[PDB]
């Protein structure tokens, strides 16, 4: 059992199982034992079986904390959202002081739009980051009202834990001579944000920057998307799913990558330990983790003048590089299809449709309140949202009612295949952004379909992304100072269709004319920046 933990700790789940099972062989029905078995299952990804057992073991010892949290982990990944929440609750009841349970609880509550004791929970996670302690996940922490400084703190602490338990590969340099090898590590190469944002760029680079060798290190297998196949077509895609961290790192070294981009990085399925092994001489943070890595192994972050302005530099560990337009490319080959009718989409046939298709953890009391206030001031408006996990949708219905709006004014879109979800935007009149974690991919999606995005650019990179897209498009009037200006601008537009029509017209002009959706230009800018970076590190060219 002690043995079994070490065996499980090591990775040998089968030997782990064998040990545990002999443990149970002694006292059948025992909490401490029954739980480890369920943890084997969880590790083995037999997630429904993990939860049966941890429920047996939880029920026999309603008081171990310990076991409660582990049952949460298992119920989370088994898609039993509300029950996983109820388990983290208990684990928090038993140990209110442990800023490792609180962090997992808070995050799971944001994702279910459960806001009980939110501020008290957030404070305790922020306290934990200020001493950290250290538990706290930098991705989850993005959802909090913390400053750039606090996110950095959270990220270092997490980075230090990794850098301590890893020995870097032998240092190497950028080749002085020959075509530059450029590498990108992601689990999202396919029908995922990363694949979706980068695909038209890679095809543009393949055509326009022949002196750069693109390499994609995919930490996920083929999902059968046209994205994965296009990405494969436009580069050398290496499937490294199932290689451990070190073998992944060695495989990047084997290919002699000069510049290596981390697309995810604190992400969730991200392999930051691969970066921690420094397989490439220059390592860049870009695009799909909207914050600092906080990490000694990351040389650079790639941003832009708006989303990462001079006043944000003190709060990055990386050195800051900027593109000449927005940091964010997108799939400009996408023909947005026509949606079903409004009725077929749950929408009324008349009425202004305000929408926000953001992830549930981005929808907080502040972002919701201000969307709801727009609805109160605009008679026949409707609010169109992504349907969310567990009972998320019902909690927002109750909150709308509490905020003095008819709950039936909220329409919840089920998750759709990307081409179908994209088409939904043609029914939307205005996209209402979230704070402090902006719409990112979803804002690019919205604008590409022709739907304007209203945002309140904040003080962190993650609260400035929507506003960068507006800024680089020329839509400055859609970046407003605060909640009051937000509700006012939206109300102004929603209650005057002629101005609204003019705005859609304006977005169409600016869509075609600005550099924002010009992936050829993006490729030339990106490539030139890569080349100039490489010469700064001794590349002589060719
Ligand atoms: O019904 C849907 C809903 C969402 N998306 C896609 O879900 C993704 C946005 O999800 P994220 O919040 O994890 C990524 P971000 O925070 O970096 O912006 C995009 O790929 C959307 O096109 C769909 O394709 N269909």
TrEMBL record:
Organism superkingdom: Bacteria
Domain O-GlcNAc transferase C-terminal: 174-327, 341-524
Positions with a binding annotation for Mn(2+): 238, 251
GO molecular function: metal ion binding; protein O-acetylglucosaminyltransferase activity
EC number: 2.4.1.255
Keyword Transferase: yes
Enzyme class: transferase
Database matches in Pfam families: Glyco_transf_41 (PF13844), TPR_16 (PF13432)
Keywords associated with the record: Glycosyltransferase, Metal-binding, Repeat, TPR repeat, Transferase
SMART domains recorded: TPR
PANTHER family: PTHR44998, UDP-N-ACETYLGLUCOSAMINE--PEPTIDE N-ACETYLGLUCOSAMINYLTRANSFERASE 110 KDA SUBUNIT
Name of protein: protein O-GlcNAc transferase
Provenance organism: Xanthomonas campestris pv. campestris (strain ATCC 33913 / DSM 3586 / NCPPB 528 / LMG 568 / P 25)
Lineage, top ranks: Bacteria, Pseudomonadati, Pseudomonadota, Gammaproteobacteria, Lysobacterales
